[PDB]
Symmetry: C3
Subunit: 33 residues, 3 copies
């Protein structure tokens, strides 16, 4: 169960990094509107 | 400890899912400009 | 390993909260029409 949680935290970490880049991009696009 | 971590990873997983749906929606509403 | 996972999920939980506030703001700025 611990290895599985580790694998899941790793993908959530990567998803979080992506979302931050997307949110930063949207902030700027919403800015331009 | 493990039950607590499981609960917390679930919380983050469902929060992440909600944010990604909203961000996907906003990308479309904002468009290119 | 367990302490390390716990520490990482704590960090991600706070990062997720920040992104939710940003997304909430953008939803409002973008609007319904």
């Amino acid at each position: 169960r611990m290895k599985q949680l580790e694998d899941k935290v790793e993908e959530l970490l990567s998803k979080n990094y992506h979302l931050e880049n997307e949110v930063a991009r949207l902030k700027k696009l919403v800015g331009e509107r």
